Amino acid sequence: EVQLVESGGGLVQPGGSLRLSCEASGFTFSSYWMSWVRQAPGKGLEWVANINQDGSQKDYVDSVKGRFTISRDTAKNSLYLQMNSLRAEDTAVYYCARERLCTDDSHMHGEEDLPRPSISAEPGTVIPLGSHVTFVCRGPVGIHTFRLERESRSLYTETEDVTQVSPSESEARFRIESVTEGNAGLYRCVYYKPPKWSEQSDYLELLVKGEDVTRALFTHCGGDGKESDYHMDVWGKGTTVTVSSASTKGPSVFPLAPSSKSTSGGTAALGCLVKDYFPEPVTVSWNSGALTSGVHTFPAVLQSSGLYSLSSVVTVPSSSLGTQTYICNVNHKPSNTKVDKKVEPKSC
Amino acid sequence: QTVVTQEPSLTVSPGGTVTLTCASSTGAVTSGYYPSWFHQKPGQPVRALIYSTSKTHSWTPARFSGSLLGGKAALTLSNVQPEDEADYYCLLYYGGPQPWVFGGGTKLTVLSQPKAAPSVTLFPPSSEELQANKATLVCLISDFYPGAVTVAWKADSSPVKAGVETTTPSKQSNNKYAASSYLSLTPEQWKSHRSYSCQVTHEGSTVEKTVAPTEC
Structure with missing residues (x-):
């Protein structure tokens, strides 16, 4: 039931403050780093804040520095983001995420038989372009099939050509005669000694010459391969933080007059522009709803002003353009504003 | 200020194969940046898919798997099924203060209708x-x-x-x-x-x- 629930989001005028809360469940909160990641509407993910297990150390993206602080309470079993001096761009949905650290350590898994296999590269893990490299895969004596996998399963090489090398061990060799940049990447050995398969090898990194590799040893994640697996295991569903200098406001309606850019075939596009209102919804009908076919009202826009705008368009024949009347019925119930306006061919 | 770039939109036929890049503005993407990949669908939380450039999870099928490709981390889909239509984000670990920079995202569309020009x-x-x-x-x-x-x-x-x-x-x-x-x-x-x-x-x-x- 590992879970994170965010709350405390809401609607604030710029310069105000909020505190987001994120209650953890189904795991030991005390033990992992925790981060806040925001997503502004219609855009991607931005990391906001990072906090330690005990609250010792923490940092913030530069945008929110000095305005946002991050904290946690293991007794209350939850994560807090205090958001002071809110700006407009701070509007987003805020998510709570469980960071993972060097869980890629010397021993993170444990398995009894069958004994997991070992992988080797000769002459090394760094190879010149166009040269030879061989993967040596070692496992128990009496292996039936030995497979060298690449990053994706289905990219792999199985073999029955296994050699017993020691009284206890047999190996298989997979050679690459001339290295391609498509050869570089992650490899891992597995074996089928019947009845069922093996645990998988460790990962191995192959690189073309141009780099320097000191692959890894007992010091797990130590330096160049800093503590990572930062795979943000668990994500909440966030809360909406809305920052707006905007009040209730009826819209102003303008006629989008059928222009010479009438769509070809005796069908023009009448339109009705619903400009600068707040908040949604706005409902649009034509001729008291007597016209349905051809009508397309659009998604509204959120303008830098903080006000919404909208457009309602109906395709309609031109012999019709001559004769009868075409009227917008625009209804903004948040301001109890109702506007009727006849769209017309322009005099010109 | 660090920037991570991935394709804004990509399209696939049911059953196809697509590859999504993730480019560091630092010029090169190694495994030491330890790339990670996530998808987000309407109404449901960001799920996480790939880590340390290739490492998979329980919820991720072998259809999905990533690698490093051409100075950019990559995610390669296979047997793309219609359920996969979502947005996809990558993640890079620049160790130190402010260690996390997300990618722009890629709206992956699985074709269920023929392409319509606007x-x-x-x-x-x-x-x-x-x-x-x-x-x-x-x-x-x-x-x-x-x-x-x-x-x-x-x-x-x-x-x-x-x-x-x-x-x-x-x-x-x-x-x-x-x-x-x-x-x-x-x-x-x-x-x-x-x-x-x-x-x-x-x-x-x-x-x-x-x-x-x-x-x-």
Whole structure:
């Protein structure tokens, strides 16, 4: 039931403050780093804040520095983001995420038989372009099939050509005669000694010459391969933080007059522009709803002003353009504003 | 200031194979940055898929798997099924303060309808709105598939970016998408130039409409 629930989001005028809360469940909160990641509407993910297990150390993206602080309470079993001096761009949905650290350590898994296999590269893990490299895969004596996998399963090489090398061990060799940049990447050995398969090898990194590799040893994640697996295991569903200098406001309606850019075939596009209102919804009908076919009202826009705008368009024949009347019925119930306006061919 | 770049939109046939890149502005993406990959679907939380460039989870099928490719981390889909239509984000670990930089994202669309080029309709400012000391050009985009469009606005033939405001694509009843773009001008800028144009680019297919001040 590992879970994170965010709350405390809401609607604030710029310069105000909020505190987001994120209650953890189904795991030991005390033990992992925790981060806040925001997503502004219609855009991607931005990391906001990072906090330690005990609250010792923490940092913030530069945008929110000095305005946002991050904290946690293991007794209350939850994560807090205090958001002071809110700006407009701070509007987003805020998510709570469980960071993972060097869980890629010397021993993170444990398995009894069958004994997991070992992988080797000769002459090394760094190879010149166009040269030879061989993967040596070692496992128990009496292996039936030995497979060298690449990053994706289905990219792999199985073999029955296994050699017993020691009284206890047999190996298989997979050679690459001339290295391609498509050869570089992650490899891992597995074996089928019947009845069922093996645990998988460790990962191995192959690189073309141009780099320097000191692959890894007992010091797990130590330096160049800093503590990572930062795979943000668990994500909440966030809360909406809305920052707006905007009040209730009826819209102003303008006629989008059928222009010479009438769509070809005796069908023009009448339109009705619903400009600068707040908040949604706005409902649009034509001729008291007597016209349905051809009508397309659009998604509204959120303008830098903080006000919404909208457009309602109906395709309609031109012999019709001559004769009868075409009227917008625009209804903004948040301001109890109702506007009727006849769209017309322009005099010109 | 560090920037991580991935393709804005990509399209696949049911059963196909796609690869999504993730480019560090530092110039190169090694395994020491330990890339990670996530998808986000409507209504449900960001799920996590790949870590340390290739490491998989319980919920991720072997259809999904990533690698490093051409200085950029990559995610390779296989036997792409319609359930996979989502947005996909990558993650890089620059150790130190501010250690996390996300990628822009990739809206992956799985084709269930044939590609529809967009219908663009462009309106001049109204005679009423101009008298109110304001000017708004209205560019309306409907009935396209996939829901990935790029909009740019043109003064006479030069480009203009200020006062542009564009919606995000939104599915219609027909399961095709629709979007709007509003260029905001002063009446002076409007009457100033020969014409103003709206370019709707949709799958390498650019459609440019025009309206003129010298109208009526």
